[PDB]
């Protein structure tokens, strides 16, 4: 399997079959799969050099790892889309041996450039992926070239991890299963030959094609993109907080020792020594229990602040801060989620250095209805839509229909200020009190960003079991906006995260 790690350098050599037996639309499917393939690797931000070659009767090196642009995402994707199905018009046969030999000539030139005994050639682990039907018919048996590339890298039991070869047929192709087995020789129990119909099945199999356990540099937003994986792996930042009140609230990891939650979940007081927080751990599904060094509550938070106006509960500044007893051991089940308007989020967004907080908010909240997610009690991921601007007023107009929490309400903005987001419209799920304090996060560039936290809502479905209703008041949820709380978050997290300028 491909070892995703910080140590060493990765080469991916993607070979594209352009034979006439493969139709033009199938080649387009290959290019789409290749696009997702190259996007996934570069999301881990490791040293990877990518070269693409197309072959029908002769190999065409559209990109070489010897060029420094092989480490650049934009140049690689541009060259990927530069590929044309008619580039092999003169020769329409199937010549896999020529492609493998081109890979060999490449490797020989690279080791000449860097050095035989130099570590720049030693550290590198090489992976080659074939997207072809496998029905080779001339040029010679590719297995001899497969053996040929082995001695140039000295492949034996002690260097098994340095070479990875895969032959997968994707699309509406008459795939020869026997041919893919020899090229994609099995190592240990891991398969190297697969037959798949579409790019999505290849997405899943390629999620199982990566060993991301090797590195621990633990950038945010690296969840898991497989339905096969556990819920905690999908949202590693999701943590569990139980105060003395015996109620369960949720939280999100943002660093190795910092936890974000809602202020309303600590009603007994500020005795943070009595609270316990559970974080996901690979060793057990119950997680690992930690103590809290210190707690910071929002000083502007007060549930009965507006009781003089008939407002029983006001969720203004419903945000709480916690310092864990010890640093959290980063793993697949325990990874932070980066706040916007931060340099870490800027790298996660692959954005230029000169970014501002308003620009990050624009990039995230770029649509009238922005889909979002929150974690339920069972760890499941649900989908909600964020409404801003003109529709933001529309989502909040339904609070005046309430009969219990606000017996005396006349002004809508007095309870739902600019700090509250919009969710619960149409078929959107409504988080309940047990899930309060959880992360409202967005997916972009295979990265997760927490834009808000669950504070309160107009409906309580939990009152594993969920059930909606169609009676006034309609379901509606409000999340504390993290973009509106930047000053205080920078006051307490300035030494933890390098916040970008406002």
């Amino acid at each position: 399997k491909i070892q995703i790690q910080r140590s060493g350098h990765l080469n991916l050599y993607l070979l594209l079959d352009c034979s006439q037996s493969v139709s033009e639309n199938d080649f387009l499917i290959f290019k789409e799969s290749a696009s997702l393939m190259v996007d996934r690797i570069f999301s881990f931000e490791i040293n990877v050099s990518v070269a693409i070659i197309t072959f029908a009767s002769e190999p065409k090196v559209l990109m070489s790892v010897l060029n420094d642009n092989s480490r650049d995402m934009t140049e690689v994707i541009s060259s990927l889309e530069n590929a044309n199905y008619k580039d092999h018009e003169n020769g329409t046969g199937t010549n896999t041996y020529a492609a493998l030999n081109s890979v060999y000539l490449m490797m020989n030139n690279q080791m000449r450039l860097l050095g035989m005994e130099t570590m720049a050639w030693q550290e590198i682990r090489h992976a080659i992926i074939l997207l072809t039907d496998g029905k080779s018919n001339m040029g010679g048996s590719p297995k001899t070239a497969v053996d040929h590339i082995r001695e140039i890298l000295n492949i034996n039991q002690k260097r098994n991890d340095y070479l990875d070869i895969y032959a997968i047929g994707v699309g509406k192709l008459d795939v020869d299963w026997r041919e893919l087995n020899e090229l994609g020789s099995k190592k240990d129990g891991e398969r190297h030959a697969f037959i798949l119909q579409d790019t999505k099945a290849l997405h899943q199999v390629f999620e199982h094609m990566l060993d991301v356990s090797k590195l621990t540099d633990t950038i945010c937003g690296v969840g898991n993109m497989s339905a096969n994986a556990s819920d905690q792996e999908r949202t590693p930042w999701h943590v569990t907080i139980k105060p003395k009140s015996q109620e369960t609230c949720r939280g999100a990891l943002i660093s190795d020792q910092w936890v974000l939650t809602a202020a309303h979940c600590f009603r007994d007081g500020n005795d943070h020594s009595l609270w316990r927080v559970n974080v996901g751990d690979p060793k057990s599904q119950w997680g690992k229990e930690f103590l809290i060094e210190k707690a910071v509550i929002s000083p502007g938070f007060d549930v009965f602040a507006k009781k003089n106006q008939g407002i029983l509960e006001f969720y203004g500044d419903d945000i709480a801060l916690l310092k864990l007893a010890q640093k959290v051991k980063m793993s697949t089940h325990a990874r932070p989620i980066c706040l916007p308007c931060t340099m870490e989020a800027n790298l996660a967004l692959r954005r230029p250095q000169g970014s501002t907080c308003r620009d990050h908010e624009n990039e995230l909240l770029n649509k009238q209805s922005v889909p979002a997610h929150f974690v339920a009690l069972n760890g499941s991921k649900l989908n909600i839509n964020l409404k801003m601007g003109v529709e933001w007023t529309s989502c909040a107009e339904v609070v005046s229909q309430e009969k219990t929490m606000f017996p005396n309400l006349t002004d809508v903005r007095e309870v739902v200020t600019d700090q509250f987001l919009c969710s619960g419209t149409q078929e959107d799920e409504s988080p309940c009190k047990g899930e309060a304090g959880g992360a409202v996060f967005l997916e972009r560039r295979f990265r997760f960003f927490q834009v808000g936290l669950v504070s309160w809502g107009l409906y309580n479905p939990c009152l594993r079991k969920r059930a909606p209703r169609s009676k006034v008041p309609p379901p509606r949820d409000f999340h504390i906006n993290l973009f509106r709380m930047q000053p205080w978050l920078r006051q307490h997290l300035g030494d933890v995260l390098n916040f970008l300028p406002l």
Partner: protein, 44 residues
Amino acid sequence: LDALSAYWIASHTTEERGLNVTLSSTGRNGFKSHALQLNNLEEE
């Protein structure tokens, strides 16, 4: 009495008895080294 005391401490005294060795070679794959403490058994 001082003589017997000094002689007896000289007779009964124990050292570390360490036999640390290092193995190194230049394989085609690079250079490697190892260390084997033997202060107190046998190691492989």
